[PDB]
UniProtKB/Swiss-Prot annotation:
ATP binds at residues 60, 95-101, 196, 218. Belongs to the choline/ethanolamine kinase family. GO terms for molecular function: ATP binding; choline kinase activity; cholinesterase activity; ethanolamine kinase activity; protein homodimerization activity; protein tyrosine kinase activity. Plays a key role in phospholipid biosynthesis by catalyzing the phosphorylation of free choline to phosphocholine, the first step in phosphatidylcholine biosynthesis. Also phosphorylates ethanolamine, thereby contributing to phosphatidylethanolamine biosynthesis. Has higher activity with choline. May contribute to tumor cell growth. Homodimer. Heterodimer with CHKB. The gene is CHKA. It comes from the Eukaryota. The modification N6-acetyllysine is found at residue 135. It is an enzyme of class 2 (transferase). The keyword Ligase does not apply. This is Choline kinase alpha. Homodimerization or heterodimerization is required for the choline and ethanolamine kinase activities. The chain holds residues 81 to 456 of 457 of the full protein. Pathway: Phospholipid metabolism; phosphatidylcholine biosynthesis; phosphocholine from choline: step 1/1; Phospholipid metabolism; phosphatidylethanolamine biosynthesis; phosphatidylethanolamine from ethanolamine: step 1/3.
Length: 344
């Protein structure tokens, strides 16, 4: 798919002035761009590279803007994210990573899950120049609840759906969750906050490799937060498939939440990646750490339900993307109460 000519010529100008070598001398008629909002920009196959410039790039078109840009640049410097080739008011030129997204069902593959754990442990070792107070989680939940209390739907169906969600007394329930998570030690670390299959790239040519085949992307929500949240949110995503092509445009299956065995496999890979010499501790000390972490992560998974449930109600009101947001909200709240119950 070709972009609008206006943006083709803007994209041409950005690539020509921000990228080195063959790009600097490129004529407009030689420029290739296609829509992946995201575009692949590329040199002609018959133009040789002059040095080490990329033959192709990703063009992403868009206080918080400052923070997102600094974060992306730092993760790029550290080789945790795609390289950053250009930044400008309207967007960014990034490294194009040959890859595909993971599907929901691949998250449980033991090699995949072990790698995700390792990649997340590395992310959580990142020092960033951002507020270290973990106020994102309840701050965001409080902010969405405020909106949800005042939503009025006009459509018959949505009015009824909102009434049911509201009948739980969400303000009181949020405070119950706050109290549970307050009594629950979890280190504050730099979190991805959205580690779903959609944001994990499987790297082309590396599919046959045991350990180095993924990259985490999409740092929109990344902030300092309870480590429990990041892992618990990830576990929750085992239950949700968003590639369903008919309404509501997702499928939920509570039965696909990782078993304690699967959770143990994941954290047995997280822990030594986070703590270099974890493997030298007494079996019962590793056991104790693992037991206490699993209780931590499953309590914080309740916050994943609550937060994304609240987020989905707000989106029902304000979004124009086609997705069964009210139904999704109900699925998340259904899982919140189900898991609250099994936990006790
Ligand atoms: Cl174990």
């Amino acid at each position: 798919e070709q972009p609008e000519p206006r943006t083709r010529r803007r994209a041409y100008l950005w690539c020509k002035e921000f990228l080195p070598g063959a790009w600097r001398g490129l004529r407009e008629d030689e420029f290739h761009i296609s829509v992946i909002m995201l575009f692949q920009c590329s040199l002609p196959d018959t133009t040789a590279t002059l040095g080490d410039e990329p033959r192709k790039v990703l063009l992403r078109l868009y206080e918080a803007m400052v923070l997102e840009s600094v974060m992306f640049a730092i993760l790029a410097e550290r080789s945790l994210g795609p390289k950053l080739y250009g930044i400008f008011p309207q967007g960014r030129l990034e490294q194009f990573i040959p890859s595909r997204r993971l599907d929901t069902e691949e998250l449980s593959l033991p090699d995949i899950s072990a790698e995700i754990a390792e990649k997340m442990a590395t992310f959580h070792g990142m020092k960033m120049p951002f507020n270290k107070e973990p106020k994102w989680l309840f701050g965001t939940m409080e902010k969405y609840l405020k909106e949800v209390l005042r939503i009025k739907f006009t459509e018959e169906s949505r009015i009824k759906k909102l009434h049911k969600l509201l009948s739980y007394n969400l303000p009181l329930e949020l405070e119950n969750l706050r109290s549970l998570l307050e009594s629950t030690p979890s280190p504050v670390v730099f979190c991805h906050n959205d580690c779903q299959e959609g944001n994990i790239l499987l790297l082309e040519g590396r599919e046959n490799s045991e350990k180095q085949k993924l990259m985490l992307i999409d740092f929109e929500y990344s902030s300092y937060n309870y480590r429990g949240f990041d892992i618990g949110n990830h576990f929750c995503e085992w239950m949700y498939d968003y590639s369903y092509e008919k309404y509501p445009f997702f499928r939920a299956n509570i039965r696909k939440y990782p078993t304690k065995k699967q959770q143990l496999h994941f954290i047995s890979s997280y822990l030594p990646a986070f703590q270099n010499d974890f493997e030298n501790l007494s079996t019962e000390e590793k056991s104790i750490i693992k037991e206490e972490m699993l209780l931590e992560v499953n309590r914080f998974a309740l916050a994943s339900h609550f937060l994304w449930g609240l987020w989905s109600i707000v989106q029902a009101k304000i979004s124009s993307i086609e997705f069964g947001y009210m139904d999704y909200a109900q699925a998340r709240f259904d899982a919140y109460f189900h898991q609250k119950r099994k936990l006790g």
